[PDB]
Write a protein that binds this ligand. Structure first.
Ligand SMILES: NC(=O)c1cccc([C@@H]2O[C@H](COP(=O)(O)OP(=O)(O)OC[C@H]3O[C@@H](n4cnc5c(N)ncnc54)[C@H](O)[C@@H]3O)[C@@H](O)[C@H]2O)c1
Ligand SMILES: Nc1ncnc2c1ncn2[C@@H]1O[C@H](COP(=O)(O)OP(=O)(O)OC[C@H]2O[C@@H](O)[C@H](O)[C@@H]2O)[C@@H](O)[C@H]1O
Length: 238
């Protein structure tokens, strides 16, 4: 394999031939350097947004991966122009990343239960690492988890305080944002490339009348997601 050792781990991690399996992902997986601009931001994002609720463990960033799904740059071209784009977390089970890298992040299928969603069927993201990380489903005897950072064309956010069984958006709206109580400090954000990164520490949002602890982000068109990084986390339980 003409690949770094960290990558080959990632290959075996998902599946279960290496280079045959790498093509099946249809994704260019480069390892980001630990002493770089990206890494110093990405690992700071993970440090700051580790929330007070989710103290059952502390995180440790093992390997970062710059990812580039095939054809995803061209599919995202319309939404590239749209304003308000954030780099947001999306945790998932390690089993699923085979399908995700190959087919992208997709909407939950027509059959799946519609009762068990906050803001209808869409694609969920968080500005807190600890909220998304929960959906890696790492256990004591399986404490290594994969988490996505994605460029998400939010656009005009329909900012709600309480779950709503949405189908169609208001006109002009492109995303839905669930307003949470505790938020990454807005005035401590930075811009990596043409993207907002909400890497502030957790503070009160000033939003009184909402049920959500943390913010969440939903998009209903699968072309509004551009995957950027695919971290490898270590859950250090207490
Ligand atoms: N999971 C999060 O990062 C997350 C972020 C913020 C907030 C939340 C909160 O969790 C609630 C549930 O969200 P859940 O992640 O289960 O998403 P849901 O829509 O129910 O389930 C679909 C799953 O299918 C995965 N997938 C997508 N494409 C593919 C593919 N090609 N191959 C294989 N798997 C694929 C996708 O990643 C997700 O795990 C939600 O209501 C919300 O309150 C989660
Ligand atoms: N009225 C609601 N309808 C549907 N889903 C809801 C509702 N209120 C909350 N949820 C969902 O429950 C979760 C709560 O979101 P946050 O307030 O940000 O809290 P979270 O970070 O997810 O941690 C609390 C979560 O873990 C457990 O304690 C508990 O099961 C709870 O869902 C999210 O998945 C959110 O979409």
């Amino acid at each position: 394999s003409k690949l770094p050792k960290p990558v080959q781990d990632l290959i075996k991690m998902i599946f279960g031939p290496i280079d045959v399996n790498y093509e099946k992902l249809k994704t260019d997986i480069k390892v980001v350097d630990r002493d770089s601009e990206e890494a110093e931001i990405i690992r700071k994002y993970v440090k700051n947004t580790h929330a007070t609720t989710h103290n059952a463990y502390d995180l440790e960033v093992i390997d970062i991966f710059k990812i580039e799904r095939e054809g995803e740059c061209q599919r995202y071209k319309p939404f590239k122009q749209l304003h308000n784009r954030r780099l947001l977390w999306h945790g998932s089970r390690t089993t699923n990343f085979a399908g995700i890298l190959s087919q992208g992040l997709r909407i939950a299928p027509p059959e799946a239960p519609v009762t068990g969603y906050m803001f209808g069927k869409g694609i969920y993201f968080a500005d807190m690492v600890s909220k998304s990380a929960n959906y890696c489903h790492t256990s004591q005897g399986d404490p290594i988890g994969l988490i996505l950072l994605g460029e998400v064309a939010l656009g005009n956010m329909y900012e709600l305080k309480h779950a709503s069984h949405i189908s169609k958006l208001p006109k002009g709206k492109h995303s839905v944002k669930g307003l949470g109580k505790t938020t990454p400090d807005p005035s401590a954000n930075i811009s990596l490339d043409g993207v907002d990164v909400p890497l502030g520490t957790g503070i009160s949002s000033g939003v009184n009348d909402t049920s959500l602890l943390y913010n969440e982000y939903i998009v209903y068109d699968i072309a509004q997601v551009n995957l950027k990084y695919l971290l490898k986390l270590k859950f250090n339980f207490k």
